[PDB]
Amino acid sequence: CTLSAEDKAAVERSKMIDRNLREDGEKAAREVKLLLLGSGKNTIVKQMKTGIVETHFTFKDLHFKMFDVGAQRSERKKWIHCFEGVTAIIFCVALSDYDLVLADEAEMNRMHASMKLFDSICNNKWFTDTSIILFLNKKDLFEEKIKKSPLTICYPEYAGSNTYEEAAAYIQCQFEDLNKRKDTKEIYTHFTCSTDTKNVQFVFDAVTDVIIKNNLKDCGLF
Amino acid sequence: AQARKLVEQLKMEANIDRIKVSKAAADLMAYCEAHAKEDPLLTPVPASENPFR
Amino acid sequence: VQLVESGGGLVQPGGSRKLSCSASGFAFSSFGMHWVRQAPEKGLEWVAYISSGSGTIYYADTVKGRFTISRDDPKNTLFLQMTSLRSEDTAMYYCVRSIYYYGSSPFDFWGQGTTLTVSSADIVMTQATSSVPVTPGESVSISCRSSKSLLHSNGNTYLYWFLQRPGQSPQLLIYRMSNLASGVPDRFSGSGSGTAFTLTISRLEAEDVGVYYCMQHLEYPLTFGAGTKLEL
Amino acid sequence: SYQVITSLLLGTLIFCAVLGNACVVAAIALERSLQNVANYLIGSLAVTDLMVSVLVLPMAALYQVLNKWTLGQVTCDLFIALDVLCCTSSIWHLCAIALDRYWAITDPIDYVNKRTPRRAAALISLTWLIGFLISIPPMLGWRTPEDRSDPDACTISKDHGYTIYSTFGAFYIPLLLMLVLYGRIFRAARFRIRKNERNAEAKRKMALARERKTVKTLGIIMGTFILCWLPFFIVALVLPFCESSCHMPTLLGAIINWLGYSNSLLNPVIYAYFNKDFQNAFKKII
Amino acid sequence: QEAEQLKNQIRDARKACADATLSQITNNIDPVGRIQMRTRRTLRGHLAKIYAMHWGTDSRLLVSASQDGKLIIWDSYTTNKVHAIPLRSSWVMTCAYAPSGNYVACGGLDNICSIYNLKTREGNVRVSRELAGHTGYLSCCRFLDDNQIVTSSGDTTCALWDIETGQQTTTFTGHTGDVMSLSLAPDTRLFVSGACDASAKLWDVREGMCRQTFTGHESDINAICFFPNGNAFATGSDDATCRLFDLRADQELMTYSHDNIICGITSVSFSKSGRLLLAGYDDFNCNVWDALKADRAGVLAGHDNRVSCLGVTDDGMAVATGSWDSFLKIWN
Ligand SMILES: C/C=C\C/C=C\C/C=C/C/C=C/CCCC(=O)O[C@H](COC(=O)CCCCCCCCCCCCC)COP(=O)(O)O[C@H]1[C@H](O)[C@@H](O)[C@H](OP(=O)(O)O)[C@@H](O)[C@H]1O
Ligand SMILES: C[C@H](CCC(=O)NCC(=O)O)[C@H]1CC[C@H]2[C@@H]3[C@H](O)C[C@@H]4C[C@H](O)CC[C@]4(C)[C@H]3CC[C@]12C
Ligand SMILES: CC(C)CCC[C@@H](C)[C@H]1CC[C@H]2[C@@H]3CC=C4C[C@@H](O)CC[C@]4(C)[C@H]3CC[C@]12C
Ligand SMILES: [C]N([C])([C])[C][C]C1=[C][N]C2=C1[C]=C([O])[C]=[C]2
């Protein structure tokens, strides 16, 4: 009885705003947050459906929100922490780009840059328990290029057959080996191609598996 | 060229009359003592004259 | 911002009529709503109140029970049900909107109202003079008094000054005894003690001619004074 | 001197149980990080166990220590009703936790979309409703003249129909349901675990370790519950139909009854103190 | 060939002016003593980690920004949510309150510091102007006036915006690195910024040029705040040390650090008298430093996650702190 009528109205408005905020939070909770990093990123985005670009796509009754951090040339040590809690991270690399040097007086190679970024993201402290949905794009051009130019240019120590299957498997294994915490997180790898739902279904399967494994870990079973 | 811009910026080297640090330090404490009783966090205000109590 | 009322007309005693207000130009859901009547050649009187979300509903003693209020947020329309209309109910009801938060301005907009022609610890507000003859360019002061201290412990004086020019709806000048309402000349000023309040016009203009009203909002049984009628 | 030792041991047990349950009940409230559907079920189980420890256990300790009932028929009926209600509630809370884990594991879509605290609230309400159903008969009916006939005894109703109904709906239906659900969970976990060559060997090691861990978890969860309740319920079912022959040694009854109550102490241990979230919360608050 | 001699010429001049450090002068100053800081109002309702918070000029209203896409203005005394602003971008990292209290700015990963007008006839918070044009995330936006707002962005450039025009009136590009924080002087004529290059630069608003540069910090500067007198400002970095710079001395005067502190500093603020340095640390705690004697006169606790933002009221009677735990607590 120590509050005036205007104070009572203000309290009512505050609790109504709190109810609206809780409803919005509940709506946002029932969503999957995926981080896109990378190289065929535009092609993957197209097949799936200056700042952060958000794409909302629903598959098999599950809503997926993918945030594209591309075009942010600023240092990632100061904004990467904003993405804590993402169910999975979609890392896209281009197989055909093993012969490219990304200019810069040929001081780096696109495959080497991609693997360095993959290692940095996977071993980052904030993502010690986040699954990675690794995508290898442009398989057709990779096959066409390895037909003539062997991938050994990018891998000096790889002595093996130049056929598509062996080279692709070796590249996938090289990307996988970057995991220094393999026990905690799973690395899903897919030769994406650029047709049909072969990517959306793989992303859905990876998300489902990650969720199931996390639930099992919570109970201690897995 | 950046050289011209940098020299233009550094031209401000001697455009300001300066006061030695001792005088500024003394003025700081002079201001603090002048308004010492006007800062409740420095002089605990009585609970009667404290809206938050 | 615009509020248009509807449902006015002649109703015989004992009848029931619903008055509806249509909102356009603002978020009806966020704003609260009020009903203030004005009997012909008489003063103002608060009728009913409804808050956003319909959580809080209050009615005046003379209308409690007979009159009920409701809101329709999706359609942005307000309804005030009326039953067993009495001869005392013959008044023009004005729909008002208020928003309650720190720094807000309750009763900041008044509609044209709907004309209706039918047939206790309350803080009584009294105004010294019913009318005062004045001339343009001369300072004019209007004083009002309250039976109870309107200055709550929070430090806010819940006094509201309303100006109703001839053939026009009331307009808010001062809403907390010290703060000028939006879209009002700076000439108007408000000052007063915990019980005595004064409204001073720095320089009277032609538009200032009208009837000045006062209200108290410390307690929800809002009371309006007889009003001060300035004439040129 | 024997009564002194019995009082010491039983009081130590009733205390430690109270402390363990109240600690979980306070932890769920004092740390924001633990308010989850599974964790709300765990907290409700802890509340049920704390009710067991505080209300039913003190009257029961008086029975054993003095070897007689010293509070009258009304108190005896209240004690029987509360004990049955709270024990059934705890068992069905374990069953509800098992069901929630099964649904979360096998229905990720529902977990993401259609899982809210309203599920935990409904599960708790249903468990308490089942407890009420099981504990109603000995108060709203039954209690035959031969029942509680000894002025210094507070035996639970031993009517054949009521005995079978209570035993079934309190231990056996929950037992079968938990067994089936945990078997499905085990199959799902095996599927997930099953689903360069040195790295393959390392992954095989990880899979084997996960299989061992899931086996250990399932074994603990089922075996504690069984070792606690099955000895009590097997006797509770056999003796009503074995009045003619079964000698019914008093020591065995005392040992089982208490195993069953100890179940209340062990439940919160298994479901919160082995839980990483609860242990982290305790470490931070302490 | 590439201005080799110039660098040391400034170095010698700056060195020559070091006669007596701040520690020597403050020997006779009595210590602040233990500050019995205790939480008075616990503002809660955010469902995600918060990053920025700014007090109003009235010392009662404050604005809080969270990654949940909701901006909440709080009534400190009554703890009431006066307004809720649904941000279009759900990656806000900075917020500001206009001195007049009529406008609110919000910015973050999106390269925009949207201006929100609180005072409207329709009674809703609608976007007034969107200050797009930055090539990187906006680190901090602060109002010089109700119509001019200065912005800091990860693109290493700070910009002065005429809100009515919606274009950069002036661009500051002297930073060779991302700029994290921005602070305004009492007179609003000049402002300072901190950058990941481990340096802070003095910026003049109207002539649009750099007057001084400070490089004491070893790592990225996270937060900065102007001293109440306006002749100095403090800066926080990942070094776990807070540093005080005097504009008229061009030199750092003292360092506020402790051996037991290793994590970075996330927030910095001054009391009304300037004797207290409210520094937010990444270790879930805020430490109060004696600005004159550089001693820990108090500490604040009760936050379950990293401290992000804090600010002292213009009245100087209370200080609010923000943390990633989504709880805002006001201390008096
Ligand atoms: C024949 C030979 C073979 C047979 C036997 C020998 C070999 C096998 C041994 C069997 C194990 C014996 C019991 C020890 C179990 C044990 O090792 O505990 C482990 C470590 O904790 C501590 O030990 C630390 C203890 C912490 C206790 C909490 C502190 C408070 C206790 C007092 C409480 C009362 C006062 C309040 C952790 O428990 P865990 O090993 O069982 O692993 C899991 C546990 O089963 C799950 O319950 C839990 O979640 P849940 O599925 O929902 O239940 C999981 O998170 C995880 O903890
Ligand atoms: C155990 C109960 C009290 C309930 C209790 O202990 N609360 C729950 C708990 O905290 O454990 C005891 C306490 C005193 C007992 C009563 C007194 O001993 C007096 C009296 C004694 C007669 O032999 C039986 C009836 C009667 C009237 C008793 C009935 C049971 C009572 C009421
Ligand atoms: C799982 C853990 C907590 C179980 C610990 C052992 C429990 C079951 C033990 C500890 C002390 C024991 C009691 C000690 C005293 C007696 C005396 C005798 O006249 C009947 C058995 C009875 C009543 C025991 C029943 C079982 C008992 C309660
Ligand atoms: C603890 N304790 C005692 C062990 C418990 C038991 C129980 C529960 N429920 C039921 C029971 C019994 C019968 O007979 C029936 C039913």
Coordinates of C-alpha atoms and ligand atoms in Angstrom, one line a residue, chain D residues 54-55 58-59 70-72 75, ligand 2:
Chain D
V54 CA 11.4 -35.7 7.4
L55 CA 7.8 -37.1 7.8
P58 CA 10.8 -40.3 12.3
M59 CA 7.5 -42.3 13.0
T70 CA 3.2 -45.6 20.9
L71 CA 1.1 -43.0 19.1
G72 CA -2.4 -44.6 18.5
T75 CA -1.2 -41.6 14.0
Ligands
LIG2 C1 4.4 -38.5 16.0 C2 3.2 -37.7 16.4 C3 3.3 -36.2 16.1 C4 3.5 -36.0 14.6 C5 4.9 -35.7 14.2 O1 5.8 -36.2 14.7 N1 5.0 -34.9 13.1 C6 5.8 -35.3 12.0 C7 7.3 -35.3 12.3 O2 7.9 -34.1 12.4 O3 7.9 -36.4 12.4 C8 2.9 -38.0 17.9 C9 3.5 -36.9 18.9 C10 2.7 -37.1 20.2 C11 1.7 -38.2 20.0 C12 0.5 -38.3 20.8 C13 0.9 -38.2 22.3 O4 1.9 -39.2 22.6 C14 -0.3 -38.5 23.2 C15 -1.2 -39.7 22.8 C16 -0.5 -41.0 23.2 C17 -1.4 -42.2 22.9 O5 -0.7 -43.4 23.2 C18 -1.7 -42.2 21.4 C19 -2.4 -40.9 21.0 C20 -1.6 -39.6 21.3 C21 -2.6 -38.4 21.1 C22 -0.3 -39.5 20.5 C23 -0.6 -39.6 18.9 C24 0.7 -39.4 18.1 C25 1.4 -38.1 18.5 C26 0.6 -36.9 18.1

